[PDB]
A paper describes a structure:
The structure is that of a small (58 residues) engineered protein, LCB2, which was developed in Baker’s laboratory as a blocking ligand of the SARS-CoV-2 spike protein. It was envisioned that solutions of mini-proteins such as LCB2 could be used in the form of a nasal spray to confer temporary protection against the coronavirus infection.
We found that AlphaFold3, AlphaFold2, MultiFOLD, Rosetta, RoseTTAFold and trRosetta all produced successful MR models for this three-helix bundle 58-residue protein, while some of the older predictors failed. While the initial models showed appreciable variability (up to 0.87 Å) and differed substantially from the final coordinates (up to 1.08 Å), the structure determination process fully converged, resulting in six refined models within 0.25 Å from each other. All structures include residues from 4 to 58, with no alternative conformations; they also include from 1 to 4 glycerol molecules and between 18 and 24 water molecules. The situation with the loop 42–44 led us to suggest that its conformation in the crystallographic structure is influenced by a crystal contact. Indeed, it turns out that residue Asn43 at the center of the loop forms an intermolecular side-chain-to-backbone hydrogen bond with the amide group of residue Glu46 in the symmetry-related protein molecule. Comparing the six structural solutions, we observe that a number of surface side chains have been solved with different conformations. Interestingly, for each individual structure the electron density is consistent with a single rotameric state and offers no direct evidence of conformational heterogeneity. We thus conclude that the six LCB2 structures obtained in this study can be grouped into a multiconformer ensemble, where structural variations are representative of protein’s conformational dynamics. While Rwork/Rfree of the individual structures is at best 0.208/0.240, the six-member ensemble yields significantly improved values, 0.187/0.220.
Residue numbers in the entry: 4 to 58
């Protein structure tokens, strides 16, 4: 239900941050946040902000 698509994007933003690319990680995070806030699941947006605490 598109929830996996947010988890996929979140993992990518961590990798791009891990590889030392801060700009791409924010962009994938912006895309992951757009979809998450348009999903009916509230845990999805909780995970997004949690990942934002890691970046």
């Amino acid at each position: 239900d598109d929830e996996d698509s947010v988890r996929y994007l979140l993992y990518m933003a961590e990798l791009r941050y891990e590889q030392g690319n801060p700009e791409k990680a924010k962009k994938i995070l912006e895309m992951a946040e757009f979809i998450a806030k348009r999903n009916n699941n509230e845990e999805l947006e909780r995970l997004v902000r949690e990942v934002k605490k890691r970046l």
